[PDB]
Amino acid sequence: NNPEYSSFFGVMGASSAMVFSAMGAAYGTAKSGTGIAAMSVMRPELIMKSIIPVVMAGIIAIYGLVVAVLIANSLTDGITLYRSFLQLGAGLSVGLSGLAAGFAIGIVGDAGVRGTAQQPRLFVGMILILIFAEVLGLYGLIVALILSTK
Amino acid sequence: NNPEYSSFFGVMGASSAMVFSAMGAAYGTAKSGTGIAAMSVMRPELIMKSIIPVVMAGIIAIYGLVVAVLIANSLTDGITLYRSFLQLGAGLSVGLSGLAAGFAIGIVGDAGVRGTAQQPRLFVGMILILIFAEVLGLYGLIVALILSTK
Amino acid sequence: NNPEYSSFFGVMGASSAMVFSAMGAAYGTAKSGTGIAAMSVMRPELIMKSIIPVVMAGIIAIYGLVVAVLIANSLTDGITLYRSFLQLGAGLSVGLSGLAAGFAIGIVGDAGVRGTAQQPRLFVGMILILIFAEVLGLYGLIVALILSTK
Amino acid sequence: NNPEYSSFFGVMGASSAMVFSAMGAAYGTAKSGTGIAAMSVMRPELIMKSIIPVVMAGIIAIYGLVVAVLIANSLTDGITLYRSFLQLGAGLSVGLSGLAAGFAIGIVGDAGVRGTAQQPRLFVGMILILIFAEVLGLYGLIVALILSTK
Amino acid sequence: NNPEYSSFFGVMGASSAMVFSAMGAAYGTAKSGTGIAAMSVMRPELIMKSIIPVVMAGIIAIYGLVVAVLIANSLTDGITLYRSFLQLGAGLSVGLSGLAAGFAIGIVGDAGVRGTAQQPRLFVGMILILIFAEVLGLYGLIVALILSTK
Amino acid sequence: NNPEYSSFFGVMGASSAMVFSAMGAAYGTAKSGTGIAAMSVMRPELIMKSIIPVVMAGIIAIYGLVVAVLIANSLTDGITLYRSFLQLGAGLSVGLSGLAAGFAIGIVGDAGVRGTAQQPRLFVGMILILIFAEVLGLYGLIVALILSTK
């Protein structure tokens, strides 16, 4: 008795949970990669220490993947329109939260590695700021899991 | 009885809360991180203190998370369209008010840490301006609670 | 009798009253923050005295909060569509008026504090101009109250 | 039986899977290739090593091709609307994720190759960052396979 | 019987006739006043003779007022849709022609006042060009009057 | 029977015929006026000759007025939809043709005036160019006359 077009919203839930987390992580890896290279032309020994922002950006894509896999496993042909809306909400709330966290990680990582070449003391501050940025994707994940496992 | 598209506005309430509060917190964190990275070159000992703007940016994401979890817990299959509109209003309030708060905190923190590199007495003024910029997120949270628990 | 979509305009009035007012206050506080920080490099003693633009920006968010709480409390299930339109109008009248007042307060705060750094005689003039920028948000509040209570 | 228009969304799933993955691969190859060409005059011996970002960009097109072939093979004229949505979801979740991976790969390849031309030791760090950027395409592929084979 | 929404287009004719004429006059006054302000610093005694462009700009607002008042006094509840269209057409024909005349007056007045600062003989030609610019708003008024009284 | 909404296209034909001709004449007058003003600083003798571009621009406004008057005079409530479309076509054909003619007049008038200050021989060619730029308004007028009186 449910609409056959109900599953469209759940499909977009999974699609957003992956696409937007991937875009956020791509930006976080790209800005951080340009920063790491422009830093490494002068201070090669800081490469592996400065790879941290890239990893924290990748964790955003992992959040997106976990939520997208959860939504995908939750999809069915008879899924109620309510559940489909829940899954679209979870998908957006993880994907765009990860997008924001990825922008923050990208800018912070670029600036932080560039500075850490100039000021070694800045490393811990950069790491703390990056943890704060990552926690935004984590909050997106928590909301998405609540919605998708109602 | 109640319309099936009622839950859509509730899930947009939750996702809007989280997404927009996370974007505000991300902008604040990114601007504050750029500011800290620029300041730390001349004045390394200020990196730890200068993370206060990042903390008050993260608190905006915490507001958004709280409202999002309230809405997510309040969602149920047959919620009245009126209740769904209330949750949408709470989500928009908290999320976009926190977005504005994040914009203000980002600009204020960037400028304030850059100034505090030069004139240490600017720090107290920066903290007060940050508190003023941050209570905007708190007003968003108050309106969101009043709407969401109504 | 009343269409069941009647409360959408009430919730959007509340959310507008808060969101737009908070955006205005955030811009005001951001511009005043940049101005204050830039001035404070050379004139540190003015840091606290120069917080007034930020306060008059926060007052705008307080107008928004008052109107938004009024609408949120005055918003029942069977709200007449006419009264819901009244509340939407009140929300817009306070929110966008606060946005205008916040832009004016921000620009005047930046200009006035930067001038005060150079010419101490400008403080009273700046405060007068800020009061004139603030009475705009006050007019918005008055019209919003008239509409909400009508 | 199933609706007339159902296959439309599956067709668009295939089209997105290939178009967006081609966009990502094309951007990755073009950006990394202009970087490589500009580098080569300064450092002719590094070209065969610098090809790696180009191969990583091509792998995004391979992901897109795999998902698109799966969709085009499974997509019959009268598939159920639910499967059609699933295939659109897989198409987007591979195509736009691979677009993000392609952008990350292009930016990282350009910057890293230009840096490696100046500092050989950046090569391994560039490989790691490229792996983290390309794995986003793999996450898109995983979500796409799950959706399309569900 | 005539439709209920008929008065909308007549009311929009009135409001447009006033609004766009006011915009044209505002632009004309703004540019002409900037020209006078720049002219004064060097040639004080020309300040009064150089207010003429502001006056010719105000003519356009007066024309908008004439048409707006005429339409407003012609409005009725049972206004036929044909008369509503005539009033809308007249309102736009005066409002936007006055806007164009205001652009012409503003630009010609700014340039001409600045020039007359440097060469007094320009004044007559400047007046002639301003007359040619204002007769555009006059033509708009003529068209609006013919439409409205028809 | 003829539809009640038929007269909308006729009133827009008149309003367009006047509005766009007025915009073209305004551009032509404004740019030629700035050109005359700049020229007059050195060569005051040439103001009354160089005014000709402005006369050419004004003739476009007269074309617009004539077509608008024809349309407005031909309007009625029962105006058959065919005649209404004919009048809209006449209005556009003269309004936008006059717009283009006025833009050409403005550009060539400014260039020709400034050149004539430097080289008096340019005046006759400026007259020819203005005529070629202005007969575009005449062609638009001819087409509008045919369509409107048809």
Added chain:
Amino acid sequence: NNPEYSSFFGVMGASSAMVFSAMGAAYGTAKSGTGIAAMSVMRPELIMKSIIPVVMAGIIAIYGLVVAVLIANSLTDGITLYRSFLQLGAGLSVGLSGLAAGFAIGIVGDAGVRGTAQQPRLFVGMILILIFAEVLGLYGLIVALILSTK
């Protein structure tokens, strides 16, 4: 049978045939007039010989006029939608083709005259290039005649 609104496309065909031809010719005249004004300062004797680009920019308007007059004389009241579409097609094929030809004439005329100021031998080449840019309007005229007389 021949729906009441059928004439709209034919009337828009006439309006396009005139408006876009007029805009092409106006751009050609404007650009070539600027070129001629710049050239005439140093090489007065070339002005009358160099008006050819303006003539060929004008001829585009004669093409547009011919097609517009033919369409306007080929409009009955109950015109079949087929013929109304044919006349819209002729109008576009001539108007936009004339617009392209006018852009070509303008660019080529400006460059060619400002070059012929430097090198006399460029004149015949400029005439050939102007002929090639001109025959685009002629091709538009051919297609428009076929469509409009069909």
Added chain:
Amino acid sequence: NNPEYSSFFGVMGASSAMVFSAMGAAYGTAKSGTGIAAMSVMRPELIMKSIIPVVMAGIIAIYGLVVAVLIANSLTDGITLYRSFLQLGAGLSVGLSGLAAGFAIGIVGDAGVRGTAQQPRLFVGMILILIFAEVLGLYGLIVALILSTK
């Protein structure tokens, strides 16, 4: 049987096949004319050789003309929607291909016309790139003929 409006799509095919080809050819002629004008002043004897890209732009225009004439002669009154959409397909096939080919001819012709002046050996290279840039319009014409004669 067939819908009244079926001829619109074939008409748009003809008008597009002419308009877009004219725009491509106009861009090609304008760019090549700028190149030739710049080239002539230093090396006068190359004008007639360098006029070749203009010839190829004219050829693009002729491709457009052939397709447009074919469609126009094919447009009957009772044209089935199938034939009409075939002709729309041909119209786009020739128009957009000719647009892109004209752009390529323009750019490569500008570059090569300039280059031949400094390095005469580049003449054959320019011609060889241009024939490849023009066989693209030829390809579009082939597909357009096949579609419009299907």
Added chain:
Amino acid sequence: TGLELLYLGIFVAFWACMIVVGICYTIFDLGFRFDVAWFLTETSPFMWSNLGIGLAISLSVVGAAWGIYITGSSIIGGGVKAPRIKTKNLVSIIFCEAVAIYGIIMAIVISNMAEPFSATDPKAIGHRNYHAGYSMFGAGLTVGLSNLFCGVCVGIVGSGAALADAQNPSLFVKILIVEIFGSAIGLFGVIVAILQTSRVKMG
């Protein structure tokens, strides 16, 4: 930002109107009017099929010509001082034109799939015909856009390769691999288009 303001204003106004309209339809229970089924079903299959063919060829040519001028500008500029460029760096042009060749081949293949119906009630048109229309549109978009991006990419890489060759003759044969990798994307698009239209038959 002149023309980009017009573009952005149109885009933002359109999508604000879409958000408001979607909210209004959903809220007023008028969702039953927003028949995407009716749209996709009444919009004739011929429209989708012929848009597919037209784009299949035209976007491929917009790719080929785009890459051709991107790389030809560099070929000519570098050839001013290094004339050896002209003969060797023509391979980039060949790779850009192969994209338009994919375009024509697939446009002809897709146009071979169109047939008349003589049926206008959607039940009579049927799943097979609607699928034929949508799949030809999908093949057109796939091949056309994949080829557009592939041509632009190969053009960029070919320009880079020509400039590199300007300064070291031995460099070309090694940068050509990047152009090959870029060119493979057009082949992938062609494969996907073929598979999309593998089981299509209008009638």
Added chain:
Amino acid sequence: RLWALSLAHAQLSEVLWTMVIHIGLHVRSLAGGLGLFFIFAAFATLTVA
């Protein structure tokens, strides 16, 4: 232009009466005299301006 300016002047005088001194005239209480004093100060200044 004569009529245009005449209408502008007439309507501006009408508004400046009916929303300044009409305020003090259309009040029930006898303090309306002092209200008129102040409102008339405002009326005079605005009319002159």
Added chain:
Amino acid sequence: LEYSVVFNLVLWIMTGLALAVIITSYNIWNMDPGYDSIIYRMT
């Protein structure tokens, strides 16, 4: 019954006219003021 046709005619004609007015007014508004030959003294 003609609602589709009249709605689209009005909507798209008015969109075209509005865009034309906005673009023309933008060009006039941001017209090069021409007194740049005077500016350098005033600045």
Added chain:
Amino acid sequence: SFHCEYVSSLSKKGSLLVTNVPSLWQMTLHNFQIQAFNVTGEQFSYASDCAGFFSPGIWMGLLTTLFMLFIFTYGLHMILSLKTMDRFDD
């Protein structure tokens, strides 16, 4: 309920009624409104109707015109962004 101006067999009036075989009858129902299910007393329920914002023909036309407008805007962007040299060689 369903409302529709002119549910009639005449081509001049929408031809909502139709026959494949020629017939002797013709019919016209100006402002035809009907409701046969979920009826409530003497009142028609809210009214759906044929008169919509868009129709199939208008949709086909609008989408074809949108594609053509994208192509024309691309071409016009390229043509407008043409430029001419400001200087010439000696």
Added chain:
Amino acid sequence: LCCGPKLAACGIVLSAWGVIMLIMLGIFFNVHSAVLIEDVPFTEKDFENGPQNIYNLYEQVSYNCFIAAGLYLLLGGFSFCQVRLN
């Protein structure tokens, strides 16, 4: 008290204008002149039995205008005194 001569001159001119105009306005209201009906503060229930009910309010507004004129006369006297000091 003291004030600038220009302020005092403005005060006396304003007082003269106010006195003349408001005396005339009070006269015209006490006359029950029709052209000033819209400014009378009457209510919709005052139209029942005859014009007297509204004549009374006309008188009231006339008294208000006379009071305002008296205030302006006192202001004029004070401004004349100020001018004399200056």
Added chain:
Amino acid sequence: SFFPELYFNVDNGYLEGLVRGLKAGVLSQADYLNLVQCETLEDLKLHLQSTDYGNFLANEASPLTVSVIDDKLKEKMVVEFRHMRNHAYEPLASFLDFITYSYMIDNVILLITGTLHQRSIAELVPKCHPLGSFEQMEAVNIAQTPAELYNAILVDTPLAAFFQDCISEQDLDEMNIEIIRNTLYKAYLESFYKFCTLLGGTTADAMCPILEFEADRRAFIITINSFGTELSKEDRAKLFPHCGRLYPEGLAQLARADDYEQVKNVADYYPEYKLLFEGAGSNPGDKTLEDRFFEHEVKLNKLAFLNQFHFGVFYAFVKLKEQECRNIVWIAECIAQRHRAKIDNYIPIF
């Protein structure tokens, strides 16, 4: 990312290739080793004739002079740049004009110095650097009037916007010509940086570092040179361009600086400047900080060619070929004065 690869080559592809062709001709390290070993200026001419320069010097008189060689090299650079400028389009044309403004800012100082010393401008024009020559005739027949020259500059020269830092012709008479030159250069450099950032894309990302280094070296060297002069700290601080990475608090600590050790302390906070200062021994017989800054500038310009679609390559080429002209002039000076011991001090390019 601004995707310049899509639309750069539409208008700037030909010159993009041509300028790189020109760069391919700048002398290599091996070419400099060839020039180093010449016995005479004629021998230098012959060894140079095999390079891109070819027979540029063959038309001059038999007794070659290093002044003549310098003039010919400058003439060649000017010819090439003027060709590119004549073939440039609006945005690239504006960028090239910004490059020329730098030389205009020195020619204008020549003009004002001549005018305040009451000399005919016709005698000054020949001494102007051709890249920034005043074509405008408003700057001719000045009658030796500073007000006339100042109005001519404001009304008919691009430097009108830069002179707005000054306000009056009286400033020309009062301020030292070096302060005028450096204030104009600060204004020009900041305007150039803003222009490059507004261009954005690869142009910004590849050019802004060069101008930032220009600002930082300006700050360092102005500070180091100002010690033994009347120039006050308060006026010195105005000369620092605010684009460089020193801008907040670095320029401030320099304005507060009163010794070379304090300038070096400011430099210590930046790794890319710490290295230059440590390497610049500055004692007699070895590299000075000027030499180290020239080397770093050459490195920065060389890096501009690693990016493809951007204007920065034209600026990099102009400065690199200027460095190459100065290198050849230096080698000629060493050959003429027989100061072979220090002939290696040329800055190698590529």
